Amino acid sequence: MIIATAGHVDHGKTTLLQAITGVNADRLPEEKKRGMTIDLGYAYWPQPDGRVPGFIDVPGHEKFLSNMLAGVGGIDHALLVVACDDGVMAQTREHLAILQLTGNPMLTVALTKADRVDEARVDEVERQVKEVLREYGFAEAKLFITAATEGRGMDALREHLLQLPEREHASQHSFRLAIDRAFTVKGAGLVVTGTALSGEVKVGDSLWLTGVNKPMRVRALHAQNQPTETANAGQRIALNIAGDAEKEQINRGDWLLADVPPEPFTRVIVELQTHTPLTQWQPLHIHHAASHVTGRVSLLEDNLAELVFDTPLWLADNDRLVLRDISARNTLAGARVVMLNPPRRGKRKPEYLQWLASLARAQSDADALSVHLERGAVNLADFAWARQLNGEGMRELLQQPGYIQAGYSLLNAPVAARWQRKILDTLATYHEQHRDEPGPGRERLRRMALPMEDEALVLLLIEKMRESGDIHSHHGWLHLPDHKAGFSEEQQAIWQKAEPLFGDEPWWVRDLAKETGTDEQAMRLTLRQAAQQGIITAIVKDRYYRNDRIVEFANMIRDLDQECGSTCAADFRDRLGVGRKLAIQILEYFDRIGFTRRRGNDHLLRDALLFPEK
Amino acid sequence: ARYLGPKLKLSRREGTDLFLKSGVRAIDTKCKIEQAPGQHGARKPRLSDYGVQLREKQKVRRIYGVLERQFRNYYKEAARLKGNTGENLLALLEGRLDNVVYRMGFGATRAEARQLVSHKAIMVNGRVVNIASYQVSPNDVVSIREKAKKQSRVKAALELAEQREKPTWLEVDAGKMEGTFKRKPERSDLSADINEHLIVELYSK
RNA sequence: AAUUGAAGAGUUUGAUCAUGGCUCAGAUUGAACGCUGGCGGCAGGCCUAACACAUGCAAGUCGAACGGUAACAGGAAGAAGCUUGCUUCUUUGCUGACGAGUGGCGGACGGGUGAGUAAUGUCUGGGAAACUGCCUGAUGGAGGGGGAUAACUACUGGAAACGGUAGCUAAUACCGCAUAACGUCGCAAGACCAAAGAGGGGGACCUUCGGGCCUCUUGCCAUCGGAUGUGCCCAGAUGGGAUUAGCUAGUAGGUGGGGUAACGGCUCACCUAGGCGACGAUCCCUAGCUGGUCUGAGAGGAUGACCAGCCACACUGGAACUGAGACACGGUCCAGACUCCUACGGGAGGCAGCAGUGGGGAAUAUUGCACAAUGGGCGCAAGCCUGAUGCAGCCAUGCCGCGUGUAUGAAGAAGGCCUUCGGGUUGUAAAGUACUUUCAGCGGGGAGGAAGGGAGUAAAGUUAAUACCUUUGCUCAUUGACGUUACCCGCAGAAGAAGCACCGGCUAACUCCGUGCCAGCAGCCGCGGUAAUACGGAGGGUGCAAGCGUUAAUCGGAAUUACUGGG
RNA sequence: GGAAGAUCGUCGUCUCCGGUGAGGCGGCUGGACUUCAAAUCCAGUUGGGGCCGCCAGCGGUCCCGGGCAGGUUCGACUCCUGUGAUCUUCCGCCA
Ligand SMILES: Nc1nc2c(ncn2[C@@H]2O[C@H](COP(=O)(O)OP(=O)(O)NP(=O)(O)O)[C@@H](O)[C@H]2O)c(=O)[nH]1
Ligand SMILES: [Mg+2]
């Protein structure tokens, strides 16, 4: 129940705070010194009842209003002061429009200066307030007429403070904290105080400070002048933290948050809500909770917009914010973050309807989640950062049927199979380049399909194809079951006329490679694939023999152990007279096959199947 | 800690059969070992004295697969030892438990020996241990844990060990793949091809 | 067995060899910056401002010293509600216990800093003219009295701080008396000096019925020792500067007095005029010293963080007393400055202790836990206290260990790079096949640190006593902050894990593209002027590896201050 | 954060400028340009984005541009009232 008071200067805001408490908001020395709200002052009223209400006095200055925009973050209920003396004012209407754009859940009207002026003036200010409340659509409000000098309003207000529901938020979110006021008490640590927009933190927690980009242990925390071991979001949180970082490095608008941020983004898609129509590509002040910014807006078809900061800044999805004119004064429109890094070329016709599908069709993070998985890989860290997912929230994607989950992005099974089918047709085209092959190798395929796409997602998708049984593989080559190795003609047109000739007698490659005119490396395809047929062998790459010579060379080699009792080379020469060169080459041939072993003078033959069984 | 990289390229930078990996083959050589250690390995640099001695020290440190710092530690302690520095150095360098696991024959590679010792499979003097860098004690038995038994690879490497000839200074009964180290080998009983003194003067700067 | 141990290069010129510096390859660090980062063990973690410090903690403890009951709980008489033996409340130190007060001891140890200090120090090796509480050995004493007072009570001051007036009381508090030599003085003879009791049990035996009595325990006094520690002295050793050569008057001795626990110009009076020194006095500058640490082959050189000892210091300048022990880090008093409160009269405080903040800076930790263990103060003891310590948290800061997978695998793919376009190359690399699950995760099992001590026990000793007390065994239970410990057994899948520098030569490792003495590289000699093996990028290779690289400082190379070891 | 200020052409700097912006200088590019540096003159220094079609963070096309706007005025780089950012200085920096 933080409850901020708001309104124009000298409506008695601080006076109201003394009325309820007799204690004050003003903490900065200059305001003490000058008797004013130079800057946002905070006050808290700890109680035996155990609530501490949070009072926030804010400047009515338009010039200081950008600071008020820093202070309207995290309000649970709002009390807009209106003085019976001065009455309703256009600035009051401005503060109401600003809180309406912030989507502040509820508000209370409190008339002040009642005794100071005659009752007819009281009724006038009453009527003017009753007119003004109807404009922004908030309905219930408890108007209180009182003089603080009289105390008339105390009882009805005190009940009213307790009446307000607290705005609970879901436990499963990464913790996030907006730095506001740095000051270091001499006792232990920095203590940095800020509104916690989401998630939960406790005194033992380590938190990731951005910019310095380092974890920092929490030394202590005080929830709201109510010291405790833990701090929940939705309240200002004094948060004392260990760390090497010091206040001189710290600046307002630095972020404290649970997880290492995605890098700051100038571009952002944002929801437009407007009291009056705006215009494309113009400078304005962006105001988010505890954030004062300047940047230029751009229009994206109709009430869809992209903000372009010239100063990149971290932000996250579904953070409500108000957009004001760059010169200050006029407040013109609200905004909400919807997409944080829209792709370039976003304006082409088919796509905008689909972006509308990503956002208008889906309110829930899960529905937007499914749309993004349908679009392509969802790096869970980024999308999760936009939704501030906790691990229990991370489980929702596992709950989703049909999604192919690699180490990050899911992919829909039917849609996965669709993308597979496209890659398969390309793979069929490679199968057309050589239908004799069972198929393309895997690494060439990964490069051939979608090189930009994630290795975890792609390899897992190939595993899904293996589970389908669509990809059977042998010798490490992955192929479709259907291929019959019909024989591609690019091989065959030389192989047909060459085959009986090379068949019927061995011939060296070059000896009639010139007669065919073929290049040597060009034959280091056709001939090795003929070796894949198992017909023509190669002792050496340049010369190729038919199997039928090699089999005879084997049977004459077989005689060494039987005729000699030794595997001496000499019988190849002692029988048919075959030369030492080609014979030693046959020896390297079986050695590379692993068909025979070398030891000392002679070959061991511990495993070959060719040797006659007896 | 382990080198984690292709093996026979480091082996073929020198063109020798470094036995870093063998498996079904004793050596490949069919990978064009002596010709292309690198992009300019087709031409052979003549390599100055510091480069040849350093290159040999690199080669041997690679065949035993040790990192440079504790390698130099082996050097400095070996110099602290009495007697010939190169000799006792090489002997204690063979004292590494993984090398002993390879020479005992159960192990496809000395790196694989680091694997199997890391997996608790070894059992020395009735106690499990993991440091392959450890130097086996004289006349000390070493055994493999009975749960380590069943892997087919170990014995299949023993059939390779038989072909290797195996060192005589260590006595592996091999009837229970539990061998005993005996004593640190003398320079006379082994190698006579590698030349260890290169390393010691290479550190003598 | 106590060692085993020493390498050069580049650069002067047209070229040579010398002389000679300058530069590099090595090692090391209380390092830093940047890049990078998976885990574990062991270490270390303000060298800057002896600069300024909030808040909390670090020094208390004994009723077995005394008077008491402030608080808590029993018990006691009584209240006597009612739930008629459940509860009601007054009084009750009478018991367990204890606030505060008096008294005993601690607080002079423990820890931090190295400012000062060039000698009042520290080290080595000696010496006489000393003291030493509590521990311990021998030795004897220990009897008999008085007068006070804090606390407390009433009065009263001052904003607070802190008192003040009056009155009451005990003590192992104080002060007397007696007492005494192996004590001190005295050549001697003689003279003179000390005090405390308390606690535990207990038969007989005295009981003003408080107590007395026996016995035991422990305390007190006295004297000589022992150990220990401390003081004092001796000679040498322990930085630089001679563009510092003259220096000193209570300073050099003498007598007497004074003074110290003790020698002594330590001090005073008086006499003498000496006294120091080129073997460097005085003066100036700098500095904590040593064991030791790095480096070196060695000799040397530099250094003296952490560990250990000694000295010196505690915001600054000072001073003195109490005390066995101080001119006293959390004692006192004076002065000053710096901060804080005040009713403005007056007051208060000192992290160079453990944490912590700020500042400085290139820059270095938890306002964490426990006395569980060791150690210490008090206590008979139990226990109390301990930021010593035991630990943990944080950091790749350093050392050490491991992993980021294994084996096989040629259809040696594609891509990249290159090419003579011949083909190489990346590469068994990949894929596949067959394995593996270290550690982490998850789940179990599960040490030693824990010795003692409590209660009781039997027995012994002691004793008038089978008691008490003492000792030895035994039974019971019990003592863990660390600790979800160490360590071990399961689960599942390579699942969670490789970077950084360099590639002209010195110096290991090269091609293309881009650029064109530009932009830029650079420890040194050097490169770049349109085809750069030196710039920038790619590919490839080399070197280190959970680390990698430039800078910071010392030694080494430097035999280039040359005793070893130069002209 | 507050109290004040200056700054943010069109390659840079300047005098500025109420006349359709003008000029000077400097740095570099190209002509003059020397065995090189140097000189003094000339021409120029494409800015920013919007929108569109490619993968081409590029082209094509359009529009605006002296920080961003407005008020003024016949005419604003100019003058004037503000206002944003960076920059400069003092004060403030309380679980
Ligand atoms: N007599 C009387 N005076 C009142 C009453 N309520 C308010 N006031 C007057 O209101 C004046 C204070 O106004 P103030 O609190 O400054 O208004 P603010 O809106 O808080 N100013 P800021 O914008 O700076 O925060 C007081 O001086 C007081 O005299 C009332 O009930 N009676
Ligand atoms: Mg106010």
Side-chain angles (χ1 to χ4, degrees), chain A residues 186 217 219 246 248 437 442 444 447 477 521:
Chain A
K186 187 178 187 181
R217 181 178 65 82
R219 297 168 69 85
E246 182 57 30
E248 294 177 350
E437 295 297 331
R442 183 182 66 191
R444 185 184 297 111
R447 182 182 65 83
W477 297 98
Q521 65 177 3

Short mmCIF file of all heavy atoms in Angstrom, two decimals, chain A residues 186 217 219 246 248 437 442 444 447 477 521, chain C residues 53 357-359 367 411 413-414 423 431-432:
data_model
loop_
_atom_site.label_atom_id
_atom_site.label_comp_id
_atom_site.label_asym_id
_atom_site.label_seq_id
_atom_site.Cartn_x
_atom_site.Cartn_y
_atom_site.Cartn_z
N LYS A 186 27.18 5.03 6.80
CA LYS A 186 28.56 4.67 7.12
C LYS A 186 28.67 3.20 7.53
O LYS A 186 29.68 2.54 7.28
CB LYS A 186 29.10 5.61 8.19
CG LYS A 186 30.56 5.39 8.42
CD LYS A 186 31.11 6.31 9.43
CE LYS A 186 32.59 6.11 9.45
NZ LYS A 186 33.22 6.99 10.45
N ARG A 217 26.42 -9.03 -3.76
CA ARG A 217 25.70 -9.59 -2.63
C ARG A 217 24.94 -8.54 -1.85
O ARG A 217 25.46 -7.47 -1.61
CB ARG A 217 26.70 -10.24 -1.67
CG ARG A 217 26.07 -10.88 -0.45
CD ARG A 217 27.09 -11.54 0.45
NE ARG A 217 27.98 -10.53 1.00
CZ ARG A 217 27.71 -9.77 2.06
NH1 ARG A 217 26.57 -9.88 2.71
NH2 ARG A 217 28.61 -8.89 2.46
N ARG A 219 23.84 -7.06 1.46
CA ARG A 219 24.22 -7.17 2.86
C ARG A 219 22.99 -7.15 3.76
O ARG A 219 22.92 -7.92 4.73
CB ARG A 219 25.13 -6.01 3.25
CG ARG A 219 26.41 -6.04 2.49
CD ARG A 219 27.20 -4.77 2.65
NE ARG A 219 27.75 -4.59 3.98
CZ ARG A 219 28.90 -5.12 4.35
NH1 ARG A 219 29.60 -5.86 3.49
NH2 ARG A 219 29.37 -4.94 5.57
N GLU A 246 30.98 1.36 -6.17
CA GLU A 246 30.77 2.48 -5.27
C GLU A 246 29.86 3.53 -5.93
O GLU A 246 29.64 3.50 -7.15
CB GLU A 246 32.16 3.01 -4.80
CG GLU A 246 32.18 4.16 -3.80
CD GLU A 246 31.44 3.85 -2.52
OE1 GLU A 246 31.36 2.67 -2.10
OE2 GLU A 246 30.83 4.80 -1.99
N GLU A 248 30.02 6.69 -6.63
CA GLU A 248 30.49 7.65 -7.63
C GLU A 248 30.31 7.13 -9.05
O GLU A 248 30.02 7.91 -9.96
CB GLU A 248 31.96 8.00 -7.39
CG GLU A 248 32.23 8.75 -6.10
CD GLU A 248 33.70 9.00 -5.89
OE1 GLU A 248 34.52 8.43 -6.64
OE2 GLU A 248 34.04 9.78 -4.97
N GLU A 437 24.34 -42.05 -55.70
CA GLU A 437 24.75 -41.96 -54.32
C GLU A 437 23.57 -42.28 -53.42
O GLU A 437 22.42 -42.00 -53.80
CB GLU A 437 25.24 -40.55 -53.99
CG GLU A 437 26.48 -40.12 -54.72
CD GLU A 437 27.67 -40.98 -54.36
OE1 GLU A 437 27.72 -41.50 -53.24
OE2 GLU A 437 28.58 -41.12 -55.20
N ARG A 442 26.25 -35.43 -43.92
CA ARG A 442 25.53 -34.60 -42.96
C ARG A 442 26.10 -33.19 -42.85
O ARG A 442 25.34 -32.23 -42.85
CB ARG A 442 25.49 -35.27 -41.58
CG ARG A 442 24.67 -34.40 -40.63
CD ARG A 442 24.50 -34.79 -39.17
NE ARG A 442 25.67 -34.78 -38.30
CZ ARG A 442 25.64 -35.31 -37.08
NH1 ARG A 442 24.53 -35.87 -36.64
NH2 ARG A 442 26.69 -35.26 -36.29
N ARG A 444 27.83 -31.45 -44.95
CA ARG A 444 27.54 -30.66 -46.14
C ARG A 444 26.09 -30.23 -46.12
O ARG A 444 25.80 -29.06 -46.35
CB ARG A 444 27.78 -31.43 -47.45
CG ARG A 444 27.56 -30.49 -48.66
CD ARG A 444 27.66 -31.11 -50.05
NE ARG A 444 28.94 -31.67 -50.43
CZ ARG A 444 29.19 -32.96 -50.60
NH1 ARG A 444 28.25 -33.87 -50.40
NH2 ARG A 444 30.41 -33.35 -50.97
N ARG A 447 25.44 -27.29 -43.78
CA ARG A 447 25.82 -26.04 -44.41
C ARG A 447 24.83 -25.66 -45.52
O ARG A 447 24.45 -24.49 -45.67
CB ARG A 447 27.23 -26.15 -44.97
CG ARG A 447 27.72 -24.88 -45.59
CD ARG A 447 29.09 -25.11 -46.15
NE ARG A 447 28.94 -26.08 -47.22
CZ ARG A 447 28.56 -25.77 -48.46
NH1 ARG A 447 28.30 -24.52 -48.80
NH2 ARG A 447 28.44 -26.73 -49.37
N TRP A 477 27.11 -41.98 -43.77
CA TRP A 477 26.44 -41.18 -44.76
C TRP A 477 24.96 -41.38 -44.47
O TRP A 477 24.48 -42.52 -44.40
CB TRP A 477 26.82 -41.69 -46.15
CG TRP A 477 28.29 -41.51 -46.42
CD1 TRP A 477 29.25 -42.47 -46.28
CD2 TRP A 477 28.97 -40.34 -46.87
NE1 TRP A 477 30.48 -41.96 -46.58
CE2 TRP A 477 30.33 -40.65 -46.97
CE3 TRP A 477 28.55 -39.05 -47.20
CZ2 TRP A 477 31.29 -39.72 -47.38
CZ3 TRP A 477 29.50 -38.12 -47.61
CH2 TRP A 477 30.85 -38.47 -47.70
N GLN A 521 42.24 -35.49 -62.28
CA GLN A 521 41.36 -35.31 -61.12
C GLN A 521 39.92 -35.57 -61.51
O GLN A 521 39.10 -35.94 -60.66
CB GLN A 521 41.48 -33.92 -60.47
CG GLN A 521 41.04 -32.72 -61.29
CD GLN A 521 41.15 -31.43 -60.48
OE1 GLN A 521 41.61 -31.45 -59.33
NE2 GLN A 521 40.77 -30.32 -61.08
P C C 53 39.85 11.36 14.19
OP1 C C 53 39.54 12.28 15.31
OP2 C C 53 40.85 10.28 14.36
"O5'" C C 53 38.48 10.68 13.73
"C5'" C C 53 37.93 9.57 14.40
"C4'" C C 53 36.76 9.03 13.63
"O4'" C C 53 37.16 8.74 12.26
"C3'" C C 53 36.19 7.72 14.14
"O3'" C C 53 35.32 7.87 15.26
"C2'" C C 53 35.52 7.15 12.90
"O2'" C C 53 34.25 7.74 12.69
"C1'" C C 53 36.44 7.63 11.78
N1 C C 53 37.37 6.55 11.39
C2 C C 53 36.88 5.48 10.62
O2 C C 53 35.68 5.42 10.27
N3 C C 53 37.70 4.47 10.28
C4 C C 53 38.97 4.52 10.65
N4 C C 53 39.72 3.49 10.26
C5 C C 53 39.53 5.60 11.40
C6 C C 53 38.70 6.59 11.74
P U C 357 33.24 -1.31 3.82
OP1 U C 357 32.48 -1.61 2.58
OP2 U C 357 34.69 -1.63 3.91
"O5'" U C 357 33.05 0.23 4.16
"C5'" U C 357 31.74 0.75 4.36
"C4'" U C 357 31.78 2.18 4.81
"O4'" U C 357 32.40 2.30 6.12
"C3'" U C 357 32.59 3.11 3.95
"O3'" U C 357 31.89 3.48 2.79
"C2'" U C 357 32.88 4.27 4.89
"O2'" U C 357 31.75 5.12 4.98
"C1'" U C 357 33.05 3.55 6.22
N1 U C 357 34.47 3.35 6.58
C2 U C 357 35.20 4.45 7.01
O2 U C 357 34.79 5.59 7.09
N3 U C 357 36.51 4.22 7.32
C4 U C 357 37.15 3.01 7.27
O4 U C 357 38.34 2.96 7.60
C5 U C 357 36.34 1.92 6.83
C6 U C 357 35.06 2.11 6.51
P G C 358 32.66 3.71 1.43
OP1 G C 358 31.53 3.86 0.51
OP2 G C 358 33.70 2.66 1.22
"O5'" G C 358 33.37 5.13 1.60
"C5'" G C 358 32.59 6.28 1.90
"C4'" G C 358 33.45 7.41 2.40
"O4'" G C 358 34.05 7.03 3.67
"C3'" G C 358 34.64 7.78 1.53
"O3'" G C 358 34.29 8.59 0.41
"C2'" G C 358 35.57 8.45 2.53
"O2'" G C 358 35.14 9.78 2.80
"C1'" G C 358 35.34 7.61 3.78
N9 G C 358 36.35 6.54 3.93
C8 G C 358 36.22 5.18 3.83
N7 G C 358 37.35 4.54 4.08
C5 G C 358 38.27 5.54 4.40
C6 G C 358 39.66 5.53 4.75
O6 G C 358 40.45 4.59 4.90
N1 G C 358 40.19 6.82 4.98
C2 G C 358 39.44 7.96 4.87
N2 G C 358 40.03 9.15 5.10
N3 G C 358 38.17 7.99 4.54
C4 G C 358 37.64 6.77 4.34
P G C 359 35.08 8.44 -0.99
OP1 G C 359 34.42 9.32 -1.98
OP2 G C 359 35.22 6.99 -1.27
"O5'" G C 359 36.53 9.02 -0.70
"C5'" G C 359 36.69 10.35 -0.22
"C4'" G C 359 38.11 10.62 0.21
"O4'" G C 359 38.39 9.86 1.41
"C3'" G C 359 39.21 10.21 -0.74
"O3'" G C 359 39.40 11.15 -1.79
"C2'" G C 359 40.40 10.05 0.19
"O2'" G C 359 40.97 11.31 0.51
"C1'" G C 359 39.74 9.48 1.44
N9 G C 359 39.83 8.01 1.51
C8 G C 359 38.82 7.11 1.29
N7 G C 359 39.20 5.87 1.41
C5 G C 359 40.56 5.96 1.69
C6 G C 359 41.50 4.93 1.95
O6 G C 359 41.32 3.71 1.94
N1 G C 359 42.77 5.44 2.19
C2 G C 359 43.08 6.78 2.22
N2 G C 359 44.36 7.08 2.48
N3 G C 359 42.20 7.75 2.00
C4 G C 359 40.97 7.27 1.73
P U C 367 29.20 -8.57 5.81
OP1 U C 367 28.12 -9.43 6.34
OP2 U C 367 29.16 -8.10 4.43
"O5'" U C 367 29.23 -7.24 6.67
"C5'" U C 367 28.73 -7.17 7.99
"C4'" U C 367 29.70 -6.47 8.89
"O4'" U C 367 29.62 -5.04 8.67
"C3'" U C 367 29.46 -6.63 10.38
"O3'" U C 367 29.98 -7.86 10.86
"C2'" U C 367 30.13 -5.40 10.96
"O2'" U C 367 31.52 -5.60 11.10
"C1'" U C 367 29.85 -4.34 9.87
N1 U C 367 28.71 -3.45 10.16
C2 U C 367 29.05 -2.20 10.66
O2 U C 367 30.18 -1.79 10.70
N3 U C 367 28.05 -1.32 10.94
C4 U C 367 26.71 -1.65 10.87
O4 U C 367 25.87 -0.81 11.18
C5 U C 367 26.41 -2.98 10.43
C6 U C 367 27.39 -3.83 10.12
P A C 411 36.66 -45.52 -48.06
OP1 A C 411 35.72 -46.09 -47.05
OP2 A C 411 37.65 -46.40 -48.74
"O5'" A C 411 35.83 -44.74 -49.17
"C5'" A C 411 36.44 -44.00 -50.22
"C4'" A C 411 35.99 -42.56 -50.26
"O4'" A C 411 34.61 -42.42 -50.75
"C3'" A C 411 36.00 -41.84 -48.91
"O3'" A C 411 36.34 -40.50 -49.18
"C2'" A C 411 34.56 -41.87 -48.46
"O2'" A C 411 34.21 -40.86 -47.54
"C1'" A C 411 33.86 -41.69 -49.78
N9 A C 411 32.44 -42.00 -49.77
C8 A C 411 31.77 -43.05 -49.20
N7 A C 411 30.48 -42.98 -49.39
C5 A C 411 30.32 -41.82 -50.15
C6 A C 411 29.21 -41.17 -50.69
N6 A C 411 27.96 -41.61 -50.57
N1 A C 411 29.42 -40.03 -51.40
C2 A C 411 30.66 -39.57 -51.55
N3 A C 411 31.79 -40.09 -51.08
C4 A C 411 31.53 -41.23 -50.42
P A C 413 38.69 -34.07 -48.51
OP1 A C 413 39.06 -34.10 -49.94
OP2 A C 413 38.89 -32.82 -47.74
"O5'" A C 413 37.11 -34.44 -48.48
"C5'" A C 413 36.50 -35.21 -49.53
"C4'" A C 413 35.01 -35.17 -49.56
"O4'" A C 413 34.43 -35.65 -48.32
"C3'" A C 413 34.52 -33.76 -49.69
"O3'" A C 413 34.57 -33.37 -51.05
"C2'" A C 413 33.12 -33.85 -49.10
"O2'" A C 413 32.24 -34.44 -50.03
"C1'" A C 413 33.34 -34.85 -47.96
N9 A C 413 33.66 -34.13 -46.72
C8 A C 413 34.84 -34.15 -46.03
N7 A C 413 34.82 -33.37 -45.00
C5 A C 413 33.56 -32.81 -44.99
C6 A C 413 32.93 -31.91 -44.15
N6 A C 413 33.48 -31.35 -43.07
N1 A C 413 31.69 -31.55 -44.49
C2 A C 413 31.06 -32.08 -45.53
N3 A C 413 31.56 -32.93 -46.39
C4 A C 413 32.83 -33.27 -46.06
P A C 414 35.14 -31.92 -51.43
OP1 A C 414 35.04 -31.75 -52.90
OP2 A C 414 36.44 -31.73 -50.74
"O5'" A C 414 34.09 -30.94 -50.79
"C5'" A C 414 32.78 -30.96 -51.30
"C4'" A C 414 31.84 -30.20 -50.43
"O4'" A C 414 31.83 -30.80 -49.10
"C3'" A C 414 32.17 -28.75 -50.18
"O3'" A C 414 31.75 -27.95 -51.28
"C2'" A C 414 31.45 -28.49 -48.86
"O2'" A C 414 30.06 -28.34 -49.09
"C1'" A C 414 31.63 -29.81 -48.13
N9 A C 414 32.78 -29.78 -47.20
C8 A C 414 33.96 -30.47 -47.30
N7 A C 414 34.81 -30.21 -46.33
C5 A C 414 34.16 -29.27 -45.56
C6 A C 414 34.53 -28.58 -44.38
N6 A C 414 35.70 -28.75 -43.78
N1 A C 414 33.65 -27.70 -43.86
C2 A C 414 32.47 -27.53 -44.46
N3 A C 414 32.01 -28.11 -45.57
C4 A C 414 32.90 -28.99 -46.07
P G C 423 44.88 -32.57 -61.47
OP1 G C 423 44.30 -33.79 -62.10
OP2 G C 423 44.07 -31.41 -61.07
"O5'" G C 423 45.57 -32.91 -60.08
"C5'" G C 423 44.89 -32.68 -58.86
"C4'" G C 423 45.75 -31.86 -57.95
"O4'" G C 423 45.56 -30.47 -58.29
"C3'" G C 423 45.40 -31.91 -56.48
"O3'" G C 423 45.86 -33.07 -55.80
"C2'" G C 423 45.97 -30.59 -55.98
"O2'" G C 423 47.38 -30.66 -55.83
"C1'" G C 423 45.64 -29.67 -57.14
N9 G C 423 44.34 -29.00 -56.92
C8 G C 423 43.07 -29.37 -57.27
N7 G C 423 42.16 -28.51 -56.87
C5 G C 423 42.86 -27.53 -56.17
C6 G C 423 42.46 -26.34 -55.49
O6 G C 423 41.34 -25.83 -55.32
N1 G C 423 43.57 -25.68 -54.96
C2 G C 423 44.87 -26.12 -55.04
N2 G C 423 45.80 -25.37 -54.47
N3 G C 423 45.25 -27.21 -55.66
C4 G C 423 44.20 -27.87 -56.17
P A C 431 31.76 -35.12 -35.21
OP1 A C 431 30.85 -34.46 -34.24
OP2 A C 431 32.84 -36.02 -34.73
"O5'" A C 431 30.88 -35.92 -36.26
"C5'" A C 431 29.88 -35.22 -36.98
"C4'" A C 431 29.36 -36.01 -38.13
"O4'" A C 431 30.41 -36.18 -39.13
"C3'" A C 431 28.96 -37.42 -37.79
"O3'" A C 431 27.68 -37.51 -37.18
"C2'" A C 431 29.08 -38.13 -39.13
"O2'" A C 431 27.97 -37.83 -39.95
"C1'" A C 431 30.30 -37.45 -39.72
N9 A C 431 31.51 -38.22 -39.37
C8 A C 431 32.51 -37.90 -38.48
N7 A C 431 33.45 -38.81 -38.41
C5 A C 431 33.03 -39.80 -39.30
C6 A C 431 33.57 -41.04 -39.68
N6 A C 431 34.70 -41.53 -39.21
N1 A C 431 32.91 -41.79 -40.59
C2 A C 431 31.76 -41.31 -41.08
N3 A C 431 31.15 -40.17 -40.80
C4 A C 431 31.85 -39.44 -39.91
P G C 432 27.49 -38.41 -35.86
OP1 G C 432 26.10 -38.24 -35.38
OP2 G C 432 28.64 -38.16 -34.95
"O5'" G C 432 27.63 -39.88 -36.43
"C5'" G C 432 26.80 -40.29 -37.50
"C4'" G C 432 27.35 -41.53 -38.13
"O4'" G C 432 28.66 -41.22 -38.65
"C3'" G C 432 27.57 -42.68 -37.18
"O3'" G C 432 26.36 -43.38 -36.97
"C2'" G C 432 28.72 -43.44 -37.85
"O2'" G C 432 28.23 -44.23 -38.92
"C1'" G C 432 29.54 -42.30 -38.43
N9 G C 432 30.66 -41.84 -37.59
C8 G C 432 30.79 -40.60 -37.02
N7 G C 432 31.89 -40.46 -36.35
C5 G C 432 32.53 -41.68 -36.50
C6 G C 432 33.76 -42.12 -35.98
O6 G C 432 34.56 -41.49 -35.28
N1 G C 432 34.03 -43.43 -36.36
C2 G C 432 33.22 -44.23 -37.14
N2 G C 432 33.66 -45.47 -37.39
N3 G C 432 32.06 -43.82 -37.62
C4 G C 432 31.78 -42.55 -37.26
#
